[PDB]
Amino acid sequence: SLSTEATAKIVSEFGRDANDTGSTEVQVALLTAQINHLQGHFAEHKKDHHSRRGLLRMVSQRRKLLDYLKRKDVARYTQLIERLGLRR
Amino acid sequence: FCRFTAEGVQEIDYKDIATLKNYITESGKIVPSRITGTRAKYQRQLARAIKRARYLSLLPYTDRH
Amino acid sequence: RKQVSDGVAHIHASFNNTIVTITDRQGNALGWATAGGSGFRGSRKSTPFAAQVAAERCADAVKEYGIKNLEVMVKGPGPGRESTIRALNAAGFRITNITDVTPIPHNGCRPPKKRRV
């Protein structure tokens, strides 16, 4: 999956605090990182459905988190979709 | 019977051929756990180690060679 | 021609026939004779007595080389194969060892569908 260093860096990047790993933004960012990574994987292993299942799962979970965020406070939602380049 | 738990090895490596040939028939075939009483986890580890050894020609696949 | 005095025997033993042939540590065969090579046919050619007579007519057919001991490569569960090996045992050969060389594939090929009744 994601290297510990990548997760730590992303947590620092989007985390309101150091150990704040539960905030919706850091979750969305982690899922986005992993999805962008797996893009290259599935570009090569097209017949690997069993992991594409997990990929699609985390895509849908990012969608659910984004919707929760957007309907909770649209400001942070806009900031996040700008930093990550999403909803497009 | 519950040997490796009494010994406590963290992993049955393939190099220790001396401790393998007693889990092997004279024909070279692996002996089931229900005969040697090894715990299933270490039985799996033994199977993997034995297959690796057979590959490195430390043990024989069979006697027909 | 020459002498060995301790050869190796091979009894290829099918359920329909039983062929026996000897060589000497080298695979260079010396003398062969089949249960079917003795006038027998049908189920008659698949009897341990046919094994007796085939053992005899190989031993005598190779006795020119005058061997005295034997390894035996028993292969295939032909009906009553101890018969021919002890026939040779009595034929003037101190059998050294027996070896089941029945070839066993590691799931290599799909077998044919067996008899249906």
């Binding site: - | 190099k15 051929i17 001396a18 690796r52 590959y55 490195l56 020609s57 430390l58 060679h65 | -």
Partner: protein, 106 residues
Amino acid sequence: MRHYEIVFMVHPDQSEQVPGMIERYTAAITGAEGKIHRLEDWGRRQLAYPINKLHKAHYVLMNVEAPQEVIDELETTFRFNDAVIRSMVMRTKHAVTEASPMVKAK
């Protein structure tokens, strides 16, 4: 960079190659910042079954810690060589710097 336990058997007639082949190989590894955690030779050693009509090849073990790129280059080196009759690399959970039931008993 991950840990590996490379073990290769070289044609015994070429046993005059090992003290230089290991040098070249560990040189590549250390140049790739690969920390050789163990190297062992068990010399010639009888084979459990013939390999290409041959017995008693020459065994070499080496536990290393290197990036996968250079060890892939290394196994390609193995493949294109001919003296090494058969190699095997396998990952391992840590670096092991210890004896072996070969050097401990031979």
